[PDB]
Amino acid sequence: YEDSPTPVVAFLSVTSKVAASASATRIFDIPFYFSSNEWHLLLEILAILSMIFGNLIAITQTSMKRMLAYSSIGQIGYVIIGIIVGDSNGGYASMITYMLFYIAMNLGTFACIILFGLRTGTDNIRDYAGLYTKDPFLALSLALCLLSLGGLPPLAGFFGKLHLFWCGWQAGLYFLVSIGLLTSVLSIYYYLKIIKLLMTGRNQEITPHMRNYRISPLRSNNSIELSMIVCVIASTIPGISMNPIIAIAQDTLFSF
């Protein structure tokens, strides 16, 4: 994901993970329920690991697409909590709405990383320092998307994680939920480490790739920004406007 171009990084990360979650529900609940004890442990192990190491790696990463990949690993580790719980003791609605919010709040982040790279050129994280002065809207969008991914205030990813941990507690997965919360804090750290840079600025901690940003030398008001602000709205309000999404995700009881 460091070498591949950022837009297909976004597309393949999010799309492969949602399709592979569809498969990881399908080929596990329908044909492998008889061994569902043993299976669960496997996923649980992976889930715990995918919640820890991912959210423990991206702390110390200087890239941006790479640490976004590790944060995506952590988010899918949260998703496996909803995979592990069956359809009865907290269904797959939590997993569904978290994949919804994951799309909505990761494609926005990748859209901001795209605009920072079609205007500056690079994807190293130290170049993000000083974006609040050049572009308050792009900085605000990336900060709101990352805060949705971390989930301090009532945003999309916070309430998605809340639904996941609700289903996990109710089903009785305490070691999944507690580790997921620890690593949610651990992810909040590096998200705010990003938000440190694109809010601060000192006229030399910025780079010569941030100094020459050039929003206006552009084709027009793109449709990139349209999907970016759509993803920002869909990472902000669906945390608030969650009851329709839960109600349309609860009526999927036929996965067996």
Binding site: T60, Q61, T62, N124, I125, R126, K193, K196, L197, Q204, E205
Partner: protein, 341 residues
């Protein structure tokens, strides 16, 4: 590399002799925002580099810092996003983890000879095992391993020196030190600094490896009475010595209070002569081609701290025959009369 830290230590002297290394770094790569995580008394020297950016204060030779300060500086070096470190803190494990916790592509450091560097290679790109455990005792160079790694022949020549120790003074420090020596009985052209006085202070810029580096005052009184006065201005490290100096050499002698090495270099640049003992004043005199004599306690320390005396043709190095800094005080006067006019 694009951003380069430096976790150096020692104080005034050891931070001064790192300027060739930093100029080497900025000569190797086109643009390097250099930073220094050094001790207090070391940041002051970093007025005189014109090649550095931040120069924070850490005292890495504390070994037992406040965890608040330790974690603050770890996160600071992380959030500055360096590509090289170049410690010369002279420690292996423990400090190697402190360099590894910084997101650095090329962790470079010095290493204890003893067992204390049990696992430093697991975290560092370069080893640099050292000598004497007191690296300033090695002398002026002190960085030949760090230099002969920096800009090794990969495409072009190393060029490890660039006219060694090009220190540089600002105009504000020049103005305030000019007002200082003009408040003294000195003129900007014809005066001579001293910077050797018996004291108990870290502002004399001595070393970490030299103990008998600072000469007494009665022996300095005999030295300065043996020479006709070219108005020698005295450079005390603390005001308590002023009333001592006036008690020894006389009330008529003019004393200037300088503790900042930047102010000291601003004094050197205006001076026309230097009679320093083994302090940073010798190297600040060899910088900007000023005539020194450079007393020492031994020819060994004199060769170690001044190896290039045959290249400036003015710093006629002086030592003591026996140890304990008991020099002749006779021929030093003769070649002082020779070189200062």
């Amino acid at each position: 590399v694009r951003r380069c830290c430096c976790v150096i230590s020692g104080g005034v002297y050891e931070n001064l002799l790192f300027f060739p290394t930093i100029q080497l770094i900025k000569d190797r790569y086109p643009g390097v925002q250099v930073d220094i995580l050094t001790t207090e008394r070391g940041k002051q020297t970093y007025e005189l580099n014109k090649n550095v950016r931040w120069a924070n204060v850490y005292d890495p030779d504390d070994h037992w810092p406040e965890p608040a300060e330790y974690t603050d500086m770890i996160g600071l070096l992380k959030g500055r996003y360096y590509d090289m470190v170049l410690s010369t803190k002279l420690a292996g494990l423990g400090h190697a983890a402190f360099l590894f916790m910084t997101t650095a592509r090329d962790r470079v450091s010095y290493i204890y000879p003893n067992v204390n560097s049990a696992g430093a290679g697991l975290m560092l790109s370069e080893t640099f095992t050292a000598e004497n455990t007191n690296l300033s005792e090695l002398g002026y160079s002190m960085y030949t391993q760090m230099e002969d790694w920096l800009g090794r022949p990969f495409r072009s020549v190393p060029r490890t020196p660039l006219l060694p120790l090009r220190v540089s003074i600002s105009r504000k420090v020049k103005e305030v030190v000019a007002a200082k020596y003009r408040n003294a009985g000195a003129v900007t052209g014809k005066f001579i600094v001293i910077h050797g006085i018996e004291s108990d202070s870290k502002a004399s810029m001595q070393s970490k490896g030299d103990a008998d580096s600072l000469l007494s005052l009665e022996k300095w009184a005999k030295i300065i009475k043996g020479v006709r006065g070219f108005k020698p201005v005295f450079v005390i490290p603390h005001e308590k010595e002023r009333e001592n100096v006036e008690d020894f050499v006389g009330d008529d002698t003019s004393i200037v209070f300088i503790t900042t090495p930047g102010q000291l270099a601003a004094l050197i640049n205006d001076s026309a002569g230097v009679i320093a003992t083994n302090t940073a004043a010798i190297q600040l005199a060899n910088a900007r081609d000023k005539p020194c004599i450079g007393l020492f306690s031994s020819e060994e320390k004199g060769k170690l701290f001044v190896p290039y005396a045959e290249e400036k043709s003015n710093c006629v190095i002086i030592a003591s025959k026996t140890g304990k800094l008991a020099d002749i005080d006779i021929g030093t006067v003769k070649n002082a009369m020779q070189v200062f006019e």
